[PDB]
Design a binder for this molecule. Sequence first.
Ligand SMILES: O[C@@H]1[C@@H](O)[C@H](O)OC[C@H]1O
Length: 271
Amino acid sequence: KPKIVLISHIKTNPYWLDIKAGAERAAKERGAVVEFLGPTTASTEDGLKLFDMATSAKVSGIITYVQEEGQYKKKINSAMEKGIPVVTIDSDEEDSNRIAYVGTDNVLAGQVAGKEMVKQIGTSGNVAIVMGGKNVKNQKERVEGFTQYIKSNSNLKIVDTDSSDAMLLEAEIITRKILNRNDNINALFCTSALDGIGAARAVKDLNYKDRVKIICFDDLDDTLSNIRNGLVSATIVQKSNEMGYRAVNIIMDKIEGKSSLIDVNVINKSD
Ligand SMILES: O[C@@H]1[C@@H](O)[C@H](O)OC[C@H]1O
């Protein structure tokens, strides 16, 4: 049995458990084993260590999350040179020899969120940002696209940006801190899966629904309920299950000698 290591951002995050589910479905169909790994707290060094161990173990393939630009290139290329195929997932290391990237165009997803934000609150007002790690590659990319969009297409001001490190409780805490130190926030932009849930708890608890609208990421059950009940105005949905499934199929196609980025969708109370 071919063994494929899948290295996640955070092993217990429901987004990554969805990715794992897709990966396991593919592995079942293709007859491979998926070893699903990752740190309990976001850590580039831990990810790289898992990558090193996978490489030393001579596994059949490696699918890896990329937490920081330029930090993965060497190990990816060294693994490719040892004949181990690498796929990146849900954040890319574009300047490497990985055979494929499975995930979103993250700057573009940010632009998409910017357009929805303008649709939801108009062209004037104050926005605060909650990101899942300040120095995390696809978070920075999402903030970059969002910022570019609203800069060119509105008069919206970003008055505060802070980090949850992609944890739910920290998202709640930081969002309360943001609402407390700012006097006229009209909306929150949340860029990782648990951020929107945490932010929603904070706005609900502080009685800011609805003075504060929320645009966030991903379609976790709590987020979809918050869209139903009016707490969240919109969420930007990625195809996480499909990313897992596709990554494993690409690795297996490579091992068996057999031979475009994933669009995002907006979900509203309509949807
Ligand atoms: O990197 C992941 C991101 O794509 C998702 O939106 O939020 C959870 C993170 O682990």
